[PDB]
Amino acid sequence: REIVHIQAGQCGNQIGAKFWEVISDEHGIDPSGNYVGDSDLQLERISVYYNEASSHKYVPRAILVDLEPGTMDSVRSGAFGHLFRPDNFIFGQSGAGNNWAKGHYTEGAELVDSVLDVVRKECENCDCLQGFQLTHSLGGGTGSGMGTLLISKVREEYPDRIMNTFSVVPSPKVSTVVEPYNATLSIHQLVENTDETYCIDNEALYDICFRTLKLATPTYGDLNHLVSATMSGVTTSLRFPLNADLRKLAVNMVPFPRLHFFMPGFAPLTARALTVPELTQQMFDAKNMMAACDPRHGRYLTVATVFRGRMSMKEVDEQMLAIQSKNSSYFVEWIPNNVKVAVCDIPPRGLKMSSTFIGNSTAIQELFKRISEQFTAMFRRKAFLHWYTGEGMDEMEFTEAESNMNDLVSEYQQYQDATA
Amino acid sequence: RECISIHVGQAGVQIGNACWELYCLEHGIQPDGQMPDSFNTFFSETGAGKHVPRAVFVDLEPTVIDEVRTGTYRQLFHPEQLITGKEDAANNYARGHYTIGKEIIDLVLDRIRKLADQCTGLQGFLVFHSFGGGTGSGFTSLLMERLSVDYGKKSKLEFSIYPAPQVSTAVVEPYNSILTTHTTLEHSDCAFMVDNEAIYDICRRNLDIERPTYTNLNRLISQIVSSITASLRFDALNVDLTEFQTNLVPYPRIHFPLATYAPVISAEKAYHEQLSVAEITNACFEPANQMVKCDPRHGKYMACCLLYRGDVVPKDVNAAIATIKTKSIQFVDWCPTGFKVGINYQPPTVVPGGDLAKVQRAVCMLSNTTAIAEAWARLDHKFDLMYAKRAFVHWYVGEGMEEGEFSEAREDMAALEKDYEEVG
Amino acid sequence: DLGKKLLEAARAGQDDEVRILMANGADVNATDASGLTPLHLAATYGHLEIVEVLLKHGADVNAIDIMGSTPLHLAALIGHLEIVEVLLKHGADVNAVDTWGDTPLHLAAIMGHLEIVEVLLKHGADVNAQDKFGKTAFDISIDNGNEDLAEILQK
Ligand SMILES: Nc1nc2c(ncn2[C@@H]2O[C@H](COP(=O)(O)OP(=O)(O)OP(=O)(O)O)[C@@H](O)[C@H]2O)c(=O)[nH]1
Ligand SMILES: Nc1nc2c(ncn2[C@@H]2O[C@H](COP(=O)(O)OP(=O)(O)O)[C@@H](O)[C@H]2O)c(=O)[nH]1
Ligand SMILES: CC(C)(C)c1[nH]cnc1/C=c1\[nH]c(=O)/c(=C/c2ccccc2)[nH]c1=O
Ligand SMILES: [Mg+2]
Ligand SMILES: [Mg+2]
């Protein structure tokens, strides 16, 4: 039933606040926690993300974490800032200065127990916890360094629960040069400790805004508008009744435990109505992917698609069948019937028709190679390593993270080349 | 001579709903158990006139059985015989069998024993479940193992939903299907498979339904189940569960009869011309009417039962059979070529909210044909494609199962396919 | 040893301490254990005024460490545009090859420092220069799908 939501660092809290804004509107929750919606379907699965409080207020099951205090002021002055449980704000007074080691071993490690005290509290109020979703970036210090520490600690305490992340991958187009360090060290943790990771690539988000949406200077608000749309569609199947929970969806999406990094896509892409053939086509188009990878460069292990709005499911079945058969060589033949479809009658805000793509594709190795090449260029010159080793890190942690990263890349390629 | 029906997982529960909905109508029982008795095999009677199904509904999550508890039949069943956990098997046989399923198995057996204790001569169980779900596969195999220990001399019959991609919600269903069949083969006496794709095509081609729902599929499935179990609920052939085994399973591992049903007519054709005994009999050897997609012309028959319902004269059945004998259905050389015949003279019933037209005559043919091995090969092939890369295996190994059980199950299946080839 | 202190002052951006250390005779071309000079370090950590001070007093603009890195390699890697310009103005070898076969153009391309890429090209960066795996900067831009870099390199 219940999902516990944790958002860490500036990016994690910024895209997290936007998520809660979007799905509150979808469910008819106002900034004061009152239900003001029309459809009873808005409340059927309201308890997945909200606790029903005393005066019938609906309160997000959300925990807000950062080492920087100014992040909590920004979220709190948001439209739904005073809807979060005030005691669920856990903030230090230092900041990590984009230093993974500070988030993971020093400042963040001094704050993690406070976060776990609040996590424990929320989990105790749950009737049947599904698991956890985390929002964070991989390129800073708090979201990446402390976020992965939080992941491991939560994994130790609740090992029989699903851990999913929405993980923002850094890009020089939206950028310091130590971000490949932070992301590599974080990916190392995500490989071992999460069940599903949605790879939200700032390189892809910038490209979409700059080249498709023709936004000359994309802002974080421009990038996060695509993120809030992606997070809404990815969680639709859990907020509006299939008989499938987080675990059932992981079992169908993850054939091998390490390869749990998803390329998300969305159609239509708009800035601040398509037909079913147009939704199906754009959903699989490389230009609609939230990870900067070309799916035609790899092969799909598993694919899930979620259509939203009133449409012909007869037509959806037909369009989804042809995009497989006509592109048959891009879906691995040793996983039969590996593309699943669901439809939700309720469309997102501002649209009558939309669709969300979730791909477990071996082409995701292009994202990991891009990070690894940047990491290696820096690491070969040993630039700024004392910044990290001054917080107690050994240099072997860097080499081990690089190595595991390249191992993950080689695993993707092996299954990309596998035959039946 | 009582029979207890057990429904496991989403598919088993929802098909159970349809079956008991049809049963009540066929016997004149209202949704509250009241009736303004041959059916005492399937319904107990309280000292107040209430007729209660001898039925258990089990699921590892509550929302499907919760609909039974609040729906039209909320007062039909024993409330304590509607049993739910909180966390389902996540399409994982290992969870249904080894970890989550064992949290509730003892409660389920104690509640079944409550029903059993009310029986003066229990014949055994009818178990309804999907192949593809984690509960339908895993918890069913666990329940069957336990039932064979605690009811050593009772018969156990299966109605099992064979998976189809058109309505499939799990890529791992081929795994669960093989795992459950391996661990159930020893414990099941006779198993009626229903291919969701076959029912799908019937609803599309015969009933004119573009996108069949689970409700459409399940009312059609309940019609075939009803024709199969009518002999137990009315007065000649297949009078007790053991007789199912005697008539349909001469070879104990080959216990998967093919069901074929006719006629299936859209409710929009209320004034259809009525088909004769000969015409509906002929329709039983048309692959379009089979519950499992396969080709009996390329198989051999080991046994064949014809169960008629309605305005059916025995001499017309005998003439229709004579045609069938002398016109390419081959029996094995070690069984009688004859066809067993049951006639239930009650007109077949249709649910008022159903998609079927009323018919004066219907027939369900049950034939043990080696041709159904084709359906095993299709599943096994899908199994082999994934297991060769060990895809999804880690989910099962992490939930109380050893990886060697995969290949142990697949080797059983290979031997089962060998059994079909040797007989054929 | 004033050489060690000059190296640390140049790394930390201690502009006053750099001037005092040099006035006492500190070796402008001192090296640490791996062959980095004060100019390498000032260029790495973005300390432009110190880069210019060192160049004014005999720093070798093209000094290499044990790995073949020049100050321009490091400035192009970290992304200090003004420093890249100052080093090129004082004779930095635009096509210096390090022990991985990388030129400044390779490192600026890899790290997405597009303005620096344009500067290095204008000063004659070799678009055909191959790293030890045979990749040019254009190969890197196509292999990693960086369209903005690929059209810069094609001008
Ligand atoms: N004919 C029919 N098939 C169904 C129904 N529900 C599911 N099926 C199929 O059953 C398979 C999925 O198994 P389920 O019965 O839903 O799963 P379960 O037994 O509840 O097990 P878990 O949910 O994994 O714990 C798929 O092949 C479905 O198409 C139904 O109501 N009628
Ligand atoms: N898409 C997106 N990226 C962000 C946002 N805020 C920060 N980032 C990105 O996150 C990374 C920096 O991590 P940050 O969250 O700011 O530092 P932290 O507070 O220590 O976790 C950079 O790659 C930034 O481009 C945001 O609102 N949206
Ligand atoms: C049938 C269908 C399309 C619903 C499906 N089949 C397997 N996977 C999915 C979709 C999802 N699979 C997931 O794993 C998923 C993850 C999720 C959900 C909520 C919150 C965080 C992550 N969200 C999804 O929509
Ligand atoms: Mg920070
Ligand atoms: Mg279920």
Q: In whole angstroms, give the CA distance from residue A227 to residue A356.
A: 12
What dihedral angle (degrees, nearest 10) is formed by the CA atoms of C43, C47, C49, C51? -20
Interstrand relation of A339-344 and A300-308 (parallel, antiparallel or unpaired): parallel
Tell me the fold of A1-255. Answer: Rossmann fold (3.40.50)
> Between chain C and chain B, are at least 3 CB pairs below 8 A?
no
Mutate: best of C8, C72, C110, C113, partner A, most A CBs <10 A: C110
- Chain A residue at shortest CA distance from B163: A337
What does the domain layout of chain A look like in residue ranges?
Answer: 1-255, 256-363, 364-420
- Which among C67, C110, C148 has CB closest to A377? C110
- The answer to whether the Cβ–Cβ distance between B172 and A302 falls below 8 Å is no
Which residues are near ligand 3 (CB < 6 Å)? A 133, 164, 196, 234-235, 237-238, 242, 244, 246, 249-250, 252-253, 304-306, 340-342, 358; B 169
Identify residue A346 by its one-letter amino acid code: I
How far does residue A66's CA lie from ligand 2's centre (Å)? Answer: 12
Contact of A340 with A251, CB cutoff 8 Å: no
Query: Which two tokens mark B230?
Result: 């009518």
Nearest CA to ligand 3 atom 14: A249
Distances (CA, A) of A265 to A142, A172, A262, A284, B19: 27, 22, 10, 7, 43
| Domains identified in chain B and CATH numbers | 1-257 (3.40.50.1440), 258-371 (3.30.1330.20), 372-424 (1.10.287.600)
What distance lies between CA B27 and its chain's CA centroid? Answer: 21
Under DSSP, the state recorded for B61 is: S
B385 assigned binding-site residue: no
Query: Which two tokens mark C105?
Result: 């153009």
What distance lies between CA A143 and its chain's CA centroid? Answer: 13
Length of chain A: 420
Q: In whole angstroms, give the CA distance from residue B96 to residue B133.
A: 9
What dihedral angle (degrees, nearest 10) is formed by the CA atoms of B172, B173, B179, B180? 150
DSSP-derived 3-state class of residue A55: coil
Query: Which two tokens mark A377?
Result: 């260029």
Q: In A249-311, at which residue ranges do the beta strands (DSSP E only) sit?
A: 261-267, 300-308
Domain housing C125: 1-155
Number of other residues whose CB lies within 10 A of the CB of residue A241: 12
Instruction: Name the interface residues of A facing C (CB cutoff 8 Å).
Output: 171-173, 175, 177, 207, 211, 292-294, 366, 369-370, 373-374, 377-378, 380-381, 383
Contact of C114 with C106, CB cutoff 8 Å: no
Experimental method: X-ray
Q: In whole angstroms, give the CA distance from residue B299 to residue B374.
A: 10
- The answer to whether the Cβ–Cβ distance between B171 and A340 falls below 8 Å is yes
Strand partners of residue B158:
B127, B191
What dihedral angle (degrees, nearest 10) is formed by the CA atoms of B14, B16, B20, B22? 70
Strand B155-162: give its sheet, edge to edge.
B82-84, B55-59, B3-8, B124-130, B155-162, B190-195
Query: Which two tokens mark A102?
Result: 């500070």
A364-420 maps to which CATH number? 1.10.287.600
Q: In whole angstroms, give the CA distance from residue A339 to residue B338.
A: 47
Q: In whole angstroms, give the CA distance from residue B192 to residue B258.
A: 7
> Which protein residues have a CB closer than 5 Å to ligand 4 (ion)?
A 96, 140-142
What distance lies between CA C103 and its chain's CA centroid? Answer: 10
Q: Which residue has the tokens 């077949």?
A: B348
Entry resolution (Å)? 1.8
Q: In whole angstroms, give the CA distance from residue B296 to residue B293.
A: 10
Q: Sign of the C-alpha dihedral, residues A386, A387, A392, A397?
A: negative
Q: Vertex B224, ends B221 and B227: CA angle to 5°?
A: 150
B65-81 in b/e form (b: 16+ CB < 10 A) is beebeeeebeebbbeeb
Q: Which residue has the tokens 């060290």?
A: A185
Q: In whole angstroms, give the CA distance from residue A255 to residue B386.
A: 9
Nearest to A398 by CA among A184, A149, A152, A144: A184
Identify residue B146 by its one-letter amino acid code: R
Query: Which two tokens mark C83?
Result: 């420093």
Q: In A101-251, at which residue ranges do the beta strands (DSSP E only) sit?
A: 131-137, 162-169, 196-201
Number of domains chain C contains: 1
Contacts of B217 (CB under 8 A, 6+ apart): B167, B196, B199, B200, B203
Architecture of domain A256-363: 2-Layer Sandwich (3.30)
Under DSSP, the state recorded for A333 is: T
Contact of B59 with B13, CB cutoff 8 Å: yes
Domain containing C57 — which CATH number? 1.25.40.20
Q: Is A96 in the pocket of ligand 2 (CB under 6 A)?
A: yes
- Chain C residue at shortest CA distance from A294: C145
Task: List, by residue number, the catalytic residues of B.
Answer: 243
Q: In B170-324, at which residue ranges do the beta strands (DSSP E only) sit?
A: 190-195, 258-262, 301-310
Q: In whole angstroms, give the CA distance from residue A57 to residue A32.
A: 7
